[PDB]
């Protein structure tokens, strides 16, 4: 298992514009299009992202292409962030994937806001970090996905995904 296969299980794959768990316009593998309520505005972003007139539909390759761009952006956002970088640097490879997963879903700002959890991860206090991570809107709104990520941080294995 790797970061790509982990995120593919978490986000699924859809080739036509759809609404995410928050109600926003998305396409492919969890690629947010816009927070706007207008479908037209979403179709406009989609064509801009792809470079062709898509009329709301993309192929598998186009989806995988946006996906590779998005994982690359998440990693780099972490390495550029003064709060995330040190945590990232301190973790093993499995746990690193779990941090990337959080960032992909919620953005760097968002993750950076989990001050207490990040400090516990840095300290390698696994059971205490899992407990604090669960006291969030994240966990209450997407509980099965949060539990998978949280178990990954707690154990340091891919069990939750096998």
Residues forming the site for Cl ion (CB under 5 A): 49, 142, 144-145
- Name the catalytic one among 11, 62, 70, 108: 11
Instruction: Name which of 96, 83, 105, 70 is nearest 152 in CA terms.
Output: 96
Distance CA 62, CA 28 (A): 8
Q: Is 73 or 85 the residue whose CB approaches Cl ion more closely?
A: 73
Residue 117 annotated in ligand binding: yes
Taking the complex as a whole, how short is the minimal distance between the CB of residue 141 and Cl ion, in angstroms?
A: 8
**Annotated catalytic residue 45:** no
Taking the complex as a whole, how short is the minimal distance between the CB of residue 157 and Cl ion, in angstroms?
A: 20
**Annotated catalytic residue 20:** yes
Q: Which two tokens stand for residue 14?
A: 């859809």
Cα–Cα distance list, 53 to 44, 45, 46, 77 (Å): 9, 11, 9, 30
CA 115 to chain centre: 18
Q: Is 15 or 91 the residue whose CB approaches Cl ion more closely?
A: 15
Task: Give me the active site residues, please.
Answer: 11, 20
Annotated binding site: 32, 104, 117, 132
């Amino acid at each position: 298992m790797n970061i790509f296969e982990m995120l593919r299980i978490d986000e699924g794959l859809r080739l036509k514009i759809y609404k995410d768990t928050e109600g926003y316009y998305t396409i492919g593998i969890g690629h947010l299009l816009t927070k706007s309520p207008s479908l037209n505005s979403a179709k406009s972003e989609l064509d801009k992202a792809i470079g062709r007139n898509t009329n709301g539909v993309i192929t598998k390759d186009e989806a995988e292409k946006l996906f590779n761009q998005d994982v690359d952006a998440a990693v780099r956002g972490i390495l550029r962030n003064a709060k995330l970088k040190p945590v990232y640097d301190s973790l093993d490879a499995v746990r690193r994937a779990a941090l990337i997963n959080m960032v992909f879903q919620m953005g760097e700002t968002g993750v950076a806001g989990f001050t207490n959890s990040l400090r516990m991860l840095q300290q390698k206090r696994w059971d205490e970090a899992a407990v604090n991570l669960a006291k969030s809107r994240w966990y209450n709104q997407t509980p099965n996905r949060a539990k998978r990520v949280i178990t990954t941080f707690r154990t340091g294995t891919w069990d939750a995904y096998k």
